[PDB]
Every structure is written in structure tokens, then in C-alpha cells.
Amino acid sequence: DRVKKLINSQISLLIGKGLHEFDSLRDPEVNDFRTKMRQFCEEAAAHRQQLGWVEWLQYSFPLQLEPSARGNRALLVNVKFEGSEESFTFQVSTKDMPLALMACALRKKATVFRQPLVEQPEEYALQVNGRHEYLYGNYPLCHFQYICSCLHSGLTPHLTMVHSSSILAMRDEQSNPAPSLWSLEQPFSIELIEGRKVNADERMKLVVQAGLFHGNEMLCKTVSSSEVNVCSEPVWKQRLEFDISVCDLPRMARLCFALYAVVDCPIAWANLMLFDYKDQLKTGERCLYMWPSVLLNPAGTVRGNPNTESAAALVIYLPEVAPHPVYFPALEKILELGRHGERGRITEEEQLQLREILERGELYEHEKDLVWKMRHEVQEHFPEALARLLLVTKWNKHEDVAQMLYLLCSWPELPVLSALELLDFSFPDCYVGSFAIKSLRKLTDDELFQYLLQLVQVLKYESYLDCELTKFLLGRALANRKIGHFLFWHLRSEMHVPSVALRFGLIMEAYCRGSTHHMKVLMKQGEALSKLKALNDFVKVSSQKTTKPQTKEMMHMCMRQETYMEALSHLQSPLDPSTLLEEVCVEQCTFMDSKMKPLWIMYSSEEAGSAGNVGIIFKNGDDLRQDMLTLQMIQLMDVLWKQEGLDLRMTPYGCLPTGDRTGLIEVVLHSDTIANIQLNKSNMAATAAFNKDALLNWLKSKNPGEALDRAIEEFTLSCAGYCVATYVLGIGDRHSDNIMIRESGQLFHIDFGHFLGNRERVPFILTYDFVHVIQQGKTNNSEKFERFRGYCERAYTILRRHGLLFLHLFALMRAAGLPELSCSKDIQYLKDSLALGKTEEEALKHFRVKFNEALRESWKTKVN
Ligand SMILES: COc1ncc2cc1NS(=O)(=O)CCN(C)Cc1ccc3c(c1)N2CCO3
């Protein structure tokens, strides 16, 4: 008590939902989750508080390595010892490991301080100055992202020697405070009693459409009520009998409802699991608080609408199918039934038919019959074809499900790629999901981080609160502070969505039990975001009444207040926990002229020097979820290309929704839009004789002498990357104001509100302004242009080879409820852009035709 009461009030404020609201529900599923997950997260907390000092560096500052390093050249480094003004600058090689650098700094200190030190290089770690980032382990310096960045930008790495006792003092201070169905052969049936708080046109009639689903797949035909006159409280009091026995209902069977008005006018929909969280087949009266429709929705949540006051409610009755409670058979009873079967002793000709269709993904009924018959052969010689076999399994026949389950329980572990496919709502079985998680345990923290966003969306397909995916995500989050950081923010940003608020709020509470210190760290971030919202509202009001210089001076005065200076300063960035947002640079803060007046907040850090000069963009009113997905997809391409030794110098900057139409974007400094550069302002070092000269002149002024060639090369590489990225993703609405260029020459895209050709197929784009720079400012430079076409081809063929990874990830994102990622049609776009139904030669020929057709469109600007 007292500390417990304080933690409870801090979790409530952090998650944006009072913990008392969980207790008011009086829900045993909610109560069992809270107790079990608190227990699981506190065990993780205790494991962590006793980690070795290097293990605790791995928890708190996971290594940031180059994609080529996962799984020569001279370098100048600056090293100081913790809390010392004195630093040493020395020459090392990119091939040297941190230990060699540390042993060298220790020899330098020993000679300066005139004593042979007690300390060995094994006792230290190198912190990147003013950053929550460390260099450690047996990796050459070039394999670290920080060193790599310093090399490309020519800057000097600045490192601090941190002794193991100082790391241990970090661990210690951050501590959690001290403490039988199968005999029921009758057809499935329900009583549709009545409707409540129903709003519809009195000239029409009300109908309830009802279906039995196992994921998206129907277990039998849909059934409908009789038409009853429209009113607030319609009364059906009728029996709805489905064509499927009670014994054949799979574990993950859901009963789906849709209420509508007819002369079709959709009103509401509601779903429920037929078995509870404790495997008991549901009986008795159920009051279903319906969700308003935008006709059956099986992917929809199986929990009632919390707004009980305004929601239309359907009252149903689940009949007593037995005198005693009926539970779903345990795994031992399932195995014993499915263990008995017949193996596919079939001809060598039909074996060639099977091999063909398993390596080939829709298939004709006779092929489904053959796949099912040859299921033993599928397990033994094609284990990666599990997803195809699971789709041919008859989920409405309990004996077929037992036979599938028996094979799954002895199925070998699958690659991460195959596992991600199995998390799709198309594989709704709980043992399948459990198996998918089992095959994902081998994900590295870097891979997990790359797919975290999609795994969090998968939580919306879960039928129960306590699931293997929640346990997996919590355990990985409590084992890695960066995973924990982003898991929190992905959950927090959806607390305003009623369908997920309970599930997401419960996961965040469990996590907080696991890391009291991190809760306080995220509270610091939440307080800055609260002040940014109040600051932005002020700007939106102030900007409609006065001029921008007046609103800017006001925003500054508001920021200069004690409460603002305190809340806005000294925090870890929500976009990147490695980034410390130290002193807010009020004078450099401003806002944009657009409708929502986004804020531009600048920071500085004495300790980080030039690297501490960072900015964040705060947006309130705009929805940044699609931008975040596109930027994560661009970053994925960048990793995939770097794994083949192809660095296209991309700028996948941070973008993170943090709340309801609220989020942050990472400022990329030393950059300007193509439109600003092309405005061709007079009395500037870039003023052009021809508007086409503007970008190159601007590049010339920023990169004098020999630096220009490096800048043209960076432009060319990034240009090839973004031409491929925008084409594959179907990024449209591309204009001079949503294309940026860095002083280094790097081109990058911004504002991804429209993707996947949003509906019209986006053609490959090539601009003459960009062609002019690639060609070093020459009319004819085929050597340079075709070297650019080589980069686009190479980048495109690498992406194609990971085509299925993009497909599986985008299929998982359908759960996000993004207006441009709703159906199969939206993903056909990525299937076409990657030309996945073709050979590498057929696809490359298609890309060439698409690139050439974009070169002719480009020449309509050149001709003038
Ligand atoms: C979806 O919106 C955005 N996406 C990316 C960027 C900015 C915005 N919005 S904005 O701040 O209103 C436009 C700022 N404009 C000066 C151009 C600019 C400059 C630097 C940027 C940037 C936009 N990005 C993120 C990277 O850093």
C-alpha cells in the first residue's frame, strides 16, 4: 500500500484509462488476465534486476548494427571517460573492435594520470555521447550504425568510456519497488429473442442475418430471421437452426450477427465465440451490444460495444445441449481420434501432380481432395506447404480437424516467413496460432522490431484476452527496452478506439508491472505530448486571428512558461528512445501554414554536440498510420537491399502515431523541398539561368569542388531507391512539395496519404529535373542515365525475391483498418507491381517496359 496505490494511479494516467474501470466490469476473463499477466511480468522484472552488466546493456541499449553485419579504412575517434572534460582523439581502423579502442583509451589515460590502472578493457562499454546508445561486443567498428553514419557524413565519432560499476548503478536505480461435445449430434440452433435501441426508417422491416464462421470461412450457410416491422424494441422470439451438428463446431467457432433494414440498409453487427476462454460451450441468455455498420463481419471483434447507453442490442438464447457443462475436448482426446487414419499410397504420376500444386494459390476441388489425401506426404516432404493443407482441411468436420491437429503436433518448426503467413485471420485455429508463435520464437530482436507493427495488428484478430501472442510480445518487450518502448506506443495510440481499448489497456498495465522505471520514462513522454497538444490548439486559434510572426512570438511565450519548459525538456524521444531531447530551442520552434498548423520543435544537447541537434514535428488533426506503414516498408526495402550489398542512401525517417489523430515525425535537418529549391529565388548561391539548372546549382552551392560528384552519386542512388519504392507501393500524388533533398544530395519522399494506387494503377514515374542532375547537367549522358536504370533494375529484382514477405506483412496490416488497405483488391496492386505470378526474366521485361514508358512521358517535358 501507498507505493502500490501511487503506481496504480500512474498506470491509469499513462494508459489513459483508470484501472478501476477494469474492476467495474466484474469480468472473470479480465480478472484472470490481470492476475496471470501481472505474475508473468513481475517474474520478468525479477529476472532483469539480476542480469549481468553486459546482459543489462543488451536489455537497455540493444546493439544498432548494419543490416550486412547481422547474423581496411582509417578512422578518427574521440573518446572521453565518464564525467571528464578531458578527451583523447586517436586513429583506429574500421576493422578494429570496441575492445581495441578501449584498451587504447586506457593506455592513453594511464600515461596522462601517471599510473598503471587497475581496470582492464573488458570492464567498460562505449556510450555514444549524449545518446542512449552503446558500442560493445566482438563486432568491427564499421558494423555499428553510429560509426557507419559518421563515415558517410565525414563526422568524428564521439564516445564515452563507461565502467561496469556505472552500468550496474543504472540497473540498480531502475529497479521495480521492493515487494462430451463429440456425442452431441443435434443441429446447432439459437433463439433470436429481441432487439433494443434500434434506429431505422419506419417504412422498412428489420432482418437479422446470422452465420457460423471459423475465421472468414463459413461453417455452413447463413440463416435469416423473418421480416418484422421497424421499431425501437423489435421482438422475434424465433429458432434459428444451422446445418452443422453441435459435435462438429470447431474450438474457434464464432457466431456472427447483422441487423439490417429492407424495403438493403445495414444497421448493426455483433459476434461472439461459441466456447468461452475456459473451453466451456456457452449456454443461457446473451445480450449483444452491437457495433454500427458502415453484410456479415466475421473478422470483427467478439466483444460487445462498450457504449451500452446508445448501442442497438440483440438479445439471444444459447440452448442447454446437455444437463452438465460441456467443454471442448482436451489435446489428448483430439490426438487419440486423429492418430487413426490411412496414408496416401498413390501412383508416381499423381505424386508429380501433388509436387506441382504444393510448389505452385487457389486450387480446384479435385486438387483439394488430392492434397488432403496426401497430407502425410505434405508433413514428411513438403512441411513448408502446411498453410495450403490447413486451407483444404474441413474445419466443419471434427474428425478431419482431429486428423489435421495430430499432424500439426508432430510438424517440424517452420521458417519465420511461413510462420507470419499462419498469423493471418485465414488460419483461426488456436493450435495453429500456438504453432505459428512457436516457429516465431527464433525471431531476432531486429526482425521482431521490423515486424512489431504487424504483430500488434494481429492482436485485433484474437478471440481471447489471454493468448500466446500477448505472452510472446510481453516477454520480448520485457527482455528488450526498445521493443517495450514501441509496443507501448503502438498500443497507446489506439486507446481512443473502443474495440481495442480493453485488450490494449490490459497489455500496457501488465507491461508497467514489469517495468516501473520505464512507466515513469513513458509518463515523461506523455506529459510532453499533452503540452504539445495544448500548444498546437493555441496555434490553430491564434493563426486565424493574427499574422504568422505574431502567432510565432506567442507560441514562444507560451513555451517559455515553467510548466512547458519542464514538460518539454529532458526526455527520450517517442520516435527513437536512443535519442535524448534535451534542451528545447524555443527560438528555433515554429509551425507550418497548413490547415492543422503542425509544430516544428527543436532540441539541443551540450553532451551530444552536433548529434544532439534534433527536431520533432507534432501533428494533431492528421492521421499518420499510413505514413508510418509506408516508411516502415521503405526501411524494410533499405535493409533488404543492404543485405545484397546495395546501399541506395534512403531516408526512412521516424513517424509515430501517439494518440487520436496525433503523432510525431522526425525532422530531417539540412533538407529542402524540390518546390522551394525550384522557386529559383534571386540573390541566392543557386539562382539559375534555366529553371532546370536550379537543383544542380543548389547541390553545387552545398557541395563545393570535389564534393559535387559524391552529391550527384547520392542523388542517383536515392532517386533509384525512391523510384522503385514509390512504384512497388503505388505512391501517388507526387509533386515538388512532397519530394525533398538533403544537402548531401539524397532525395527522399514525404506525405504518404495515398498508396497502392489510390483506385487506379500508378505508372512508373521519371522527372526531367532529376534526369538532368543524374546526367551531371548534360543533355546526353547515357553512361550516367543507364547506370541509374541498372540501380532501379537491381533494386526491383531484390524486392521481388522477398515478394512473399511484403505480401504476408501487408495481409497482416488489413487488421489495422486503413481506408486504403481494406480488401484483397488493395493487395492485388502489390501482387502486380512485384509481378509475382511470373519468372525473373518475364518480370524484368515488364519492369523495363514500365520504366521505358516512364522515359517517354519524361521526354514530353525535355522536348520543350
Ligand atoms: C506527413 O507530413 C510530413 N511528413 C514528413 C515531413 C513533414 C511533414 N509535415 S510538415 O512538417 O507539415 C512539412 C514540413 N516541410 C517544411 C518540409 C519538411 C522538412 C523536413 C522534414 C519533413 C518535411 N518531413 C519529415 C522529415 O523532415
UniProtKB/Swiss-Prot annotation:
GO CC annotation: cytosol
Say yes or no: keyword Membrane present.
Answer: no
| Entry-linked CDD domains | C2_PI3K_class_I_beta_delta, PI3Kc_IA_delta
Primary localisation category = cytoplasm
Q: Boundaries of each PI3K-RBD domain copy?
A: 72-163
Q: What class of enzyme is it?
A: transferase
Region ranges (Catalytic loop): 730-738
Q: Name one GO molecular function term.
A: ATP binding
**Which superkingdom, per the lineage?**
Eukaryota
Which catalytic reaction applies to this protein?
A: a 1,2-diacyl-sn-glycero-3-phospho-(1D-myo-inositol-4,5-bisphosphate) + ATP = a 1,2-diacyl-sn-glycero-3-phospho-(1D-myo-inositol-3,4,5-trisphosphate) + ADP + H(+); a 1,2-diacyl-sn-glycero-3-phospho-(1D-myo-inositol) + ATP = a 1,2-diacyl-sn-glycero-3-phospho-(1D-myo-inositol-3-phosphate) + ADP + H(+); 1-octadecanoyl-2-(5Z,8Z,11Z,14Z)-eicosatetraenoyl-sn-glycero-3-phospho-1D-myo-inositol 4,5-bisphosphate + ATP = 1-octadecanoyl-2-(5Z,8Z,11Z,14Z-eicosatetraenoyl)-sn-glycero-3-phospho-(1D-myo-inositol 3,4,5-triphosphate) + ADP + H(+)
Q: Which residues carry this modification: Phosphotyrosine?
A: 364
Domain PI3K/PI4K catalytic positions = 585-859
One of the GO BP terms on file:
positive regulation of angiogenesis
User: Coiled-coil segments, which residues?
Assistant: none
- Location of the PIK helical domain: 339-514
- Known PROSITE patterns for this protein? C2_PI3K, PI3_4_KINASE_1, PI3_4_KINASE_2, PI3_4_KINASE_3, PI3K_ABD, PI3K_RBD, PIK_HELICAL
Regulation of activity is described as: Activated by growth factors and cytokine receptors through a tyrosine-kinase-dependent mechanism. Activated by RAS. IC87114 inhibits lipid kinase activity and is selective in cells at doses up to 5-10 uM. Among other effects, IC87114 reduces allergic responses, prevents the recruitment of antigen-specific T cells into target tissue, and affects natural killer cell chemotaxis.
Which region ranges are annotated with the description G-loop? 591-597
Annotated region (Activation loop) at 749-767
Q: Which Pfam families match?
A: PI3_PI4_kinase, PI3K_C2, PI3K_p85B, PI3K_rbd, PI3Ka
Expressed in which tissues: Abundantly expressed in adult mouse spleen as well as in testis. Isoform 1 is expressed in spleen and lung (at protein level). Isoform 1 is expressed predominantly in leukocytes.
What's its job? Phosphoinositide-3-kinase (PI3K) phosphorylates phosphatidylinositol (PI) and its phosphorylated derivatives at position 3 of the inositol ring to produce 3-phosphoinositides. Uses ATP and PtdIns(4,5)P2 (phosphatidylinositol 4,5-bisphosphate) to generate phosphatidylinositol 3,4,5-trisphosphate (PIP3). PIP3 plays a key role by recruiting PH domain-containing proteins to the membrane, including AKT1 and PDPK1, activating signaling cascades involved in cell growth, survival, proliferation, motility and morphology. Mediates immune responses.
What this protein is called in its record is Phosphatidylinositol 4,5-bisphosphate 3-kinase catalytic subunit delta isoform
Q: Which species expresses this protein natively?
A: Mus musculus (Mouse)
